[PDB]
């Protein structure tokens, strides 16, 4: 029922690693302060996305057993999850409680940031569906670790090795879902279902960058590797 001492140790370790990220307040304060051009927002995006990948690699390296994995599988896991992890973190940031009217202004600013119309609606639909779950910080951290340690990622040679590392994280998350939401026995299943919805963002992530309403689409060499853009 309750977390065991080993699970409590695992949870605080994942939380400490997860907390090394930029505070949501920092990101939203920047976007709410003043409106920027599509060109200025494109550069803000590439800076933030580059920093997110760097922080994600350090978080991933700290995941128990990750560094014991086959090196090619390590690359396949990071490359397969980087985009999904960024959208999950964007959903967390979007659903953080702000003063009256601020979340509406934040949504309006992102809606007019330069991103194409085709990608706007699905993005906010995902953020609002994530928001309805009313996830705790621990749920976001564990869910991010579960996304990274996905054994059914493309090019993974040894699935079982990845399964073994993901399994205890799923066990902790399931227990937390039962504790934080005993009224909703579907909470855990819903979280896992949202991970399938996250995967549809990989299908058009490169296009979301390429279709940004700017004249030139300059990317950092690290972003080119992770987002499949030139």
């Amino acid at each position: 029922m309750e977390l065991t001492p080993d699970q409590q140790t695992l949870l605080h370790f994942i939380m400490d690693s997860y907390n090394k990220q930029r505070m949501p307040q920092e990101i939203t304060n920047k976007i709410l302060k003043e409106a920027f051009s599509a060109e200025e927002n494109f550069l803000i995006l590439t800076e933030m996305a580059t920093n997110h990948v760097q922080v994600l690699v350090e978080f991933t390296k700290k995941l128990p057993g990750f560094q014991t994995l086959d090196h090619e599988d390590q690359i396949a896991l990071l490359k397969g999850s980087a985009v999904e992890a960024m959208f999950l973190r964007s959903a967390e940031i979007f659903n953080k409680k702000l003063p009256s009217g601020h979340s509406d202004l934040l949504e309006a600013r992102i809606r007019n940031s330069g991103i194409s119309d085709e990608y706007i609606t699905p993005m906010f639909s995902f953020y609002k569906s994530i928001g309805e779950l009313k996830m705790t910080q621990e749920e976001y951290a564990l869910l991010t670790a579960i996304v990274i340690l996905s054994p059914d990622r493309q090019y993974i040679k040894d699935r079982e090795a990845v399964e073994k590392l993901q399994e205890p994280l799923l066990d902790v998350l399931q227990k937390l879902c039962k504790i934080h939401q005993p009224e909703n026995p579907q909470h855990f299943a819903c979280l896992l279902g949202r991970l399938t919805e996250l995967r549809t963002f990989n299908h058009h992530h490169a296009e979301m960058l390429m279709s940004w309403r700017v004249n030139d689409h300059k990317f950092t060499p690290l972003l080119c590797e992770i987002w499949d853009v030139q």
Partner: peptide
């Protein structure tokens, strides 16, 4: 060929 990702993974 994920040269930078490889470097970030293999450093330290």
């Amino acid at each position: 060929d994920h040269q930078l990702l490889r470097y970030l993974l293999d450093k330290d």
